[model samples]
Target: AFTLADRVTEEMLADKAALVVEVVEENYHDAPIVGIAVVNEHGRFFLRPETALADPQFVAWLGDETKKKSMFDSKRAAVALKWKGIELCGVSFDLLLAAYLLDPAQGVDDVAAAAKMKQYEAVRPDEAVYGKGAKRAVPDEPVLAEHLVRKAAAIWALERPFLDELRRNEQDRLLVELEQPLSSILAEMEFAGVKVDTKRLEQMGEELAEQLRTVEQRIYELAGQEFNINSPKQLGVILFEKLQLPVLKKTKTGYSTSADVLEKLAPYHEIVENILHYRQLGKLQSTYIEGLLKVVRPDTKKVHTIFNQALTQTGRLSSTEPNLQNIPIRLEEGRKIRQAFVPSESDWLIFAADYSQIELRVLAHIAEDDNLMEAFRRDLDIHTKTAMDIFQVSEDEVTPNMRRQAKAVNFGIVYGISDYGLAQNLNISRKEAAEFIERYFESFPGVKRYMENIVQEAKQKGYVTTLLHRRRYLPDITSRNFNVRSFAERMAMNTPIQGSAADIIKKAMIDLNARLKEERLQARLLLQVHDELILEAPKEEMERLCRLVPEVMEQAVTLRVPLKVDYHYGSTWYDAK
Candidate 1:
């Protein structure tokens, strides 16, 4: 089925069309690409590149951007190459990326589905040859060679057609220019990782444990009887049967002891608030404190989270293997988790830069709403402005409560939230929520028009596109079912705005990466959580980074309204905020 070559000659590598490649690695993380496989019109071939690992010329040849190659998940391979100290390049086409761009909801790992979508031949399952789960192991040389060749052959077959499909969809530039380059940059950031202060996390864990114990005792005192607080079955009986709190909901097992249920019952009993506090502290203790400690590398004391660049349909990147993006910041107890994220070296500071109200700005730009744009153009507090307009009050008369409700309304509008959703969010009556939305639409008529037009466009075209041309398909936009159609309509109204904001941040990251090198600055981008970019730099270069980061980020893309960025730096990540 394939030819195993001891050496690859210039003649064999001369055919650019034949450079459909697959990398064989011992494992996905902290592993080297031990072998290379390629398929051509003539036949499939394999080579053990480990023999040339020590040769700088061979490494450079493999990394050269000019020598174009096609493959699946080029980013994963690029990371593995970087692990072996090689800066990979020439990834002209990635089957995984093409599949994602075409339809993000579809599983990119399903090579068969991707092939079927492109009307190409099916691929053999690697699982069938390599086994699955813990039993998964690379087979003997004959089996290994054939399996890898098939994958290369699969890429070889799908490359041209995938590019053609993207071209027809007007997503070719998005794939080749934005996502591809960003993938490489993401790989570099992953390899750099983030420093962790294990001692700080341990101390926080101890404090959380003490707080949990105190809260637990308070709950017991309020109940007037001891019960297993962690057990919902036990706690529910204590609340409903003993204390006689009203049961808002029930389950097959017993009363619903969910957070929302307890929230409603808070006014009925003092114990409810204690239980909620205890739960929050418990999450902080387990998820952040203990969780952060588990993933920190023993040697480097750093955590390298895997960013799922292609996972989300909205084009937002997600992190896993310990999601750093979700460390709670709203509550002080949860926000303290930032203290554990420190600079990797002495004389270095953690620097943070984030866009302010990015989604709202994107909405103003796309909707061309004069009121919304004017608020941002004049640098007024948008929520306060919104409150003044909605309540028919002067700026001085806009109370804190009014601004808070208006803030929710602004966010709800961007999310395409219904009146019912707004009512639940603001803890207000549905009628009031509906009135607020109506007044908002009347004030920002352009936004209302944009929403109406976007849904109509989706119904006709069956899809939506971001500013960068990242497309999202909405098959149910034309559905006769009201529930399904309503959901699709909301998605159509939201996707373009949300996805464009994501696009802007991603572009900023790429621009900042280049600008750092161009200016000869030593600042390194560490983590990105939607709107913010986190970095660590020498204290000596602090002033340069503060000026450079916002300059690059604010100008990443020009919108109708100016993009504003906030920057701060400190000895620790916590202080940086």
Candidate 2:
């Protein structure tokens, strides 16, 4: 036993000195936050040619010992993110991360923010460097070269100051240990984009179109009139005025025909039900069917999403140019779209490994809830356990409804959702929901104490730190407004749990990447949708991937309670799920 533990430790930390070279930023995938490489779109300086002893510029970019010493803070410190042709190079600091950390709301207030940072003068806007509008294109060769050099040089110049700031916050360790290494893993995942079942996509799109037509016709027929169901003004008029359904709520100008309001009034009129179904169909049609179709590459059939790391304030990853993460899998209508996403190879499967009840498990660990830990350790169905405890029932006596409410309460504690929101979700009265919440806290007093304590910490420190020490600043924690302060307090309670989960997954990906290389596995990770990771592998590799993935994920980070993973495999994403 001692020998085995020693070997494991040796393997884990053997290359600890070497891993500082590879990293990610701007895309939060690792212990995760992306420090994006600023490629001056108009400048092509890095694109080069072979030369005697190699070009001086190219060698400096790669690594010459002198360049290494000045750029990175150490003679030994190095950087290498070899995307192509691949040479070894190490960057000292992530300038964008430096720039972003010094100021927030970049990728939004970019130009204005850069104009105010601590520079000899502030960094100039891109529009000034590259002309705006019609004048914007790569400049004439001579000017363009300087433009490229200035920006590239500016990054190095900013590196020293950025490292200074990172040290102040212990972010230097965070970056080297996790963020930097995570970048390369995210790059590999991005490069190995998921495969799409084009034929299935086409059929699903056609079926959705037909359903939309049918729903539209039914909605119009039941209303006994023709009007755009999408127009809230027209929708409200038909529901309240024509159908005479009692208004549950009102907007500024008219009756509310929102999802909740529509749901409440559904029994009042047949048209209300028809309108609700129609709206769902409409969203599925417009967003999934049509919106997704446009982004599927002609050659790849895959939607290669740009994972923006620096975007979310909570230190979470966001997908854009097509939001793969937002694909609604819970509802059947949305779930059907997953069928269109098949693997790349013949007979290959889309293997999905999802962290089961991760946040709650994280809550169990973070809050040190003894009951929750025991429930998980015993492999108890957490919802059933909660229901049994809350309702004071035996193992066999917990009803599905009771279990469901228990589940909602479990999530409510994680999200810090109010009784009003919980009531809306479970279709219960506010008083009943409030009672359930109170009972839940009583049942798990440690969790209640955690919620109280974390909020106090946030108020005192104006921030919260994840397990990896990723800081989320909460300026509004001490706000005078109840609603604003409540939101910030909830964020304080939730960010560490959510952020730590992200960190664990990211660390798993990094280790998995290293292991895949070590084992010479061909399986490639394709997508990370919150708690789940989707990958494609050959039949021969499928079993290996299944075992390896969850193992990597479960052991990615240590916690008080064991992390659990549930996975599936099929020819398509829909079936895999």
Candidate 3:
């Protein structure tokens, strides 16, 4: 009895090595599965198409009112599953996910590609078998069945090797203990989806349209004519020719009206200010308003974003089919978009917990910088302490300007700071930039050593490793070109910090999910973006949810410095932040 991702049941046993069962539905996309072709493990068979409902399991499930919806198209795949009676079937593995763990960039791209990780040659790529894009369709039964049988056998063959590879890489526990369980939790979150207050969203859309209209008018008035503000040619002619504004930069196309260029021009002319505001509002109107509306299912009044767990190299999860993670929160108009995200029940509240200075804390631990560790330990203002150290001044003497510069210094090290980059960013002289970086490094001496050592290690081994054994290869670390090598070095220094931080959140999500289930709490995780987790719970569970989230996150892993989390709850996602 083999049912990995495929749910299966059986009353009969096969004496052969394998079987390839075919599931043929007249209307494959949205129709109830008429019957399934069953291939038994170690059994030879091509059983006739039985009336699916004639089976007791299918009959029982057919009456399931909830199964009428999509995402539950049919259960013939598992209706008579013999694996159901197999108690040890509790141990499950997804070959697809295992391939992803082995190599995120290319492995697990498809089952065939995953099998290739072991240099196996029998499987064919899906595209090669079924074609792609508009020209794709299922092949004949014999061919289809043969391909599926190969897929089934591949899983069994790859299981031991994959597990051994993970064990060799020290990823077995991370897979078994953290990622596997979290995969189901995430799947449930997607299936449950997050409720959207469509009426509120549409209302906000109206206000934004009016605001956009007003901004368009201001832009036209400032430009002295009505034109497509979105058109770079028109904006370029108006700004540089008609208005005669001093051009900060130029491209072959025209004057650079990019956000960076326009930001510099903001103080120089009213047109630039109008244009920037217009562009900001326009993005919010399009990306958030229309983009979200298209994904909200009419039946559920929810947006269920598909989480791509294997996509990012840093172990961070991403969202597609309307990326919930990409929504901006810096501007007020952008923040309003989150207001539409509400709890499914009116009595429930949206609660969020975000780690404070997570990446910096990771750096503090990895670098083993006593000063940085002490700042976090004492719960002191990190940026302020950094300013005091760099400026050689007391806490009282650290002005906001100094603190801002120190913050730049702190973040600069993480990204592999350069004098020119710092000068351009901080609007300071290159000499001053170099001086500040030197002083900052002097303050955190261990960090300087870590950066040097990590880059050297990458050059020696062609990769950097995170705390979770997530390896990021830096092929250009030893490149002859200064620019290429420098970027790779920066990546080598930063990947561990960023990747470890991502690993932390993932572990925490798993812990929190387990806690919720263990305690039988009403709260459930709805979304995760970077270091923040958004959850929903009934009013009665609010206090417990709030208490539990931070507890789980702070203790997700042990490090030199204690982890810290900030939390809040409200009626809306925006307020929960």
Candidate 4:
């Protein structure tokens, strides 16, 4: 008989004996007594019976060597059984699927929490414990124990069918292929924590704070009163009520005080310029300077950020804590934040490679437009070429301003921006913006076809992807609501372009990191700010790396256009810019 504990009664033995018989019958034969053990939090219990031994002798053996041997044996047997079960049942595959079903955004920790909750509820039904025949109320320990056990079983059952289906459908193939390789990559990245110059970061933080205060005071003086600049309500009152400036638009509560609205008003009102200054300064203070200071570890003096490989529906990695994604590179104040990152004691230099016009390339590739493809192959300036084709101008007649407008138009179309948005961006009339977009579509007929096809495909299949098969599900594509439908349509148009760019960058990072390791280089990848990478490497490697990094990224994925990378280097991140 297989028993879990030495204190087991005859009734317990009978129950277990019956279970063993049932198991044998279920398997259609006498299978070997693999092993039996009691698994507690910290340890296990076991029993072994010896051949040709009297009851007393058996009992004595159980008290001595038999117990020790059986305990070890049972542990080994249990481990082997677990491995065999996982191999046959594809347990991890099912667990991941079940987790995705329960909460698509949740990770493994969420699964564990959910399992614990289920286990507690199962062993102690509320009605039995809370009501009449309860023995001096239910004990918390037992209740918890019961809940955990039930939860475990429920999770296991929930995942079981998913595993079976995955096996049957052979969908587990990709998962099996990806799991170990991805894990190994992540482990190496974690091991190679990037070095941070805390003193430099703190100094930058101080300088930024002083600058922010200056901006804040100037805004306050412009407003002619002391008020919370961060608070929108207060700013709205100062702008519209106190200053009596012209109101562009009205929300239900008050005048619109968003950055875009303020930007529109900046040319007309001095106060609007001050408000924009305040907004820019506040963003710098909160997001970059002070935020960087908060996340620095005392031990390593480095910000160890985690990259979430599975989070994005499109298989793009996202950074969190201090999100490396939203770091501003366009603005000088934001760019200055990079001054905090530097190489470790080992001599090194920062190497960075960013994709140039990646979204446009994706648009061209998906559209399969001949003009766009030809322009790419010839290494033409895309925006200038676009302006020449779309505006019916000669290549020499494509003025710098026209090319800039064309560039915005190219990106805006991919993002599903309307005529109004384009007009706002270019300071053009709505009619002119509309004409520009129409002409763009006329010039690149293939892009128009691609846009329509993407929307239709998303509607029919409820998902979209890049060339690499990164997915984004859009259930709202079929929504009846106009707003929902519009949002889904935009996503359908944008997902492939944006998602493909993201995938290319991720692949580049992985490749670059691998190359660095293989070459035993001191260069370390510090940060990824959307289209850019910040690295710290030996100063000696600067010239070679600047060329190599861009080369790797540009070749990471082939698109319709030649990928371009802009490079800079210095003692500090800001200096590099």
- Measured by TM-score, the strongest candidate is 1
lDDT of 4: 0.59
- Cα error of candidate 4 at position 55, Å: 36
Which residues of candidate 1, in runs, are more than 4 Å off?
Answer: 6-12, 15-27, 32-35, 40-42, 48-58, 125-134, 220-228, 250-254
If scored against the real structure, what TM-score would every candidate get?
0.93, 0.83, 0.84, 0.72
TM-score of 3: 0.84
lDDT of 3 by residue, 256-359 (tens): 88888888878778778878888887888788888899878898898876677777777788876568997778877688788899999979999999999898
Give one digit per residue, the lDDT tens place, for model 1 in 451-529: 9999999988989989998888999998899888888888999999989999999999999999999999888999998
lDDT of each: 0.83, 0.67, 0.73, 0.59
**What ranges in model 4 sit over 4 Å off?**
1-109, 112-180, 267-269, 414-420, 427-432, 542-548, 558-569, 575-577
Which has the better lDDT: candidate 1, or candidate 3?
Answer: 1
Positional deviation of residue 87's Cα in model 4 after best superposition, in angstroms? 22
Q: On a 0 to 100 scale, what is the lDDT of residue 6 in model 1?
A: 70
Tens digits of lDDT, candidate 4, 452-490:
999999988777876645556688888999878877887
Q: Count the backbone clashes (under 3 Å) in each candidate.
A: 0, 17, 11, 13
* Residue range with the least summed lDDT across 10 consecutive positions in model 3: 67-76
lDDT of 2 by residue, 390-488 (tens): 998998998899999998988886666877889988988999998998898788888889989999998898788878777777898888998888888
Question: Judged by TM-score relative to the true structure, which candidate is superior, 1 or 4?
Answer: 1
Off by over 4 Å in 2: 1-92, 98-121, 127-150
